[PDB]
Paper text:
Here, we showed three complex structures of 6mA demethylase C. elegans NMAD-1A, a canonical isoform of NMAD-1 (F09F7.7). NMAD-1, one of the AlkB family members in C. elegans, demethylates the DNA damage modification such as 6mA and 3mC. C. elegans NMAD-1A protein has 291 residues involving an N-terminal extension (NTE), a nucleotide-recognition lid (NRL), a DSBH domain, and the CTD. Like other AlkB family proteins, NMAD-1A requires the binding of the cosubstrate α-KG and ferrous iron for catalysis.
Although we finally obtained the structure of mut3 NMAD-1A1-291 full-length crystals, the ZFD exhibited poorly defined electron density. Here, we illustrate the structural features of NMAD-1A by the mut3 NMAD-1A1-291-Mn2+-α-KG structure mainly. Additionally, the DSBH is notably wrapped around and stabilized by additional elements from the NTE, NRL, and CTD, with the NTE domain packing on one side and the NRL domain and the CTD on the opposite side. In the NMAD-1A1-291-Mn2+-α-KG complex structure, the Mn2+ ion is in an octahedral geometry and coordinated by NE2 atoms of His-184 and His-239, carboxylate oxygen of Asp-186, and the C1-carboxylate and C2-carbonyl groups of α-KG, respectively. Notably, the CTD interacts with and further stabilizes the Flip2 region by hydrophobic contacts, including Tyr-272, Leu-276, and Leu-279 of the CTD as well as Pro-124, Val-133, and Phe-138 of the Flip2 region. In addition, SAXS analysis showed that NMAD-1A existed mainly in the form of monomer in solution. Hence, four copies of NMAD-1A found in each asymmetric unit were due to the crystal packing.
Author numbering: 36 to 289
Write the structure that this text describes.
Amino acid sequence: VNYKVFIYDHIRQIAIPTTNLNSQSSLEDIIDESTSCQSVSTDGSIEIDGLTLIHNFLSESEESKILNMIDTVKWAKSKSGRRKQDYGPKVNFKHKKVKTDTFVGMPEYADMLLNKMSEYDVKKLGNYQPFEMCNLEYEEVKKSAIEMHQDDMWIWGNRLISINLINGSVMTLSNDNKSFLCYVHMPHRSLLCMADECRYDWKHGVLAHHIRGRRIALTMREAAKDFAEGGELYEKYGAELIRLGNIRVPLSKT
């Protein structure tokens, strides 16, 4: 609460400070601020490192094909009212232990999604090797939410990709040391990449009140430098994870 609040201007990729917004601010006010911020001046602006939001990343046709494949696959129970579908290794983060027995491969839609990411930006989202692609489902009735946190950096890489599917939401990012809080409004069919400062310096979260109806987030993760070639864990675990990630599970009826 005792922190500066900023709203993200996608057009200029800068965060503009506001006293109108607050910790408990409603989703509607944040969407309203996102439109109002473009008018506001650059004074107090911060630049987020590695935060990229792509509007209209997925066409309605592309979303529909992916959603039919996702809903055809079974949904698994998760903490925080969320539900999860995982296409990645099972890892004990505490003991640094990885099991690849349950990893049969990446989902079929990954090939289409990855190619599109490279077409927009080979530098920003290209050269991506998938390690875990997890689809997470949030329902307002279940008050689904993800608590504020920074994802593991041991096996997961710098770039974190979330695509909002059935509906959009607001990402809450907190830099506790500098006492700065930013709200990023993620619209329907939007890709958010959190990396660099957002991945480590900032923490990522989605609040329960920012969830309206049902939303599915197509989370994608990449190989950590250690698991990749030139790393200690590549031979023991990484090489298999790269091959298994290359494999594509058939999820579409033709």
